[PDB]
């Protein structure tokens, strides 16, 4: 999310 991650695995 903004402020943090995304992660696509």
Same mark, same amino acid.
């Given at each position: 999310?903004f !402020? !943090? *991650?995304? *992660?696509?695995?």
């Open positions: 999310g !402020g !943090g *991650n995304d *992660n696509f695995g």
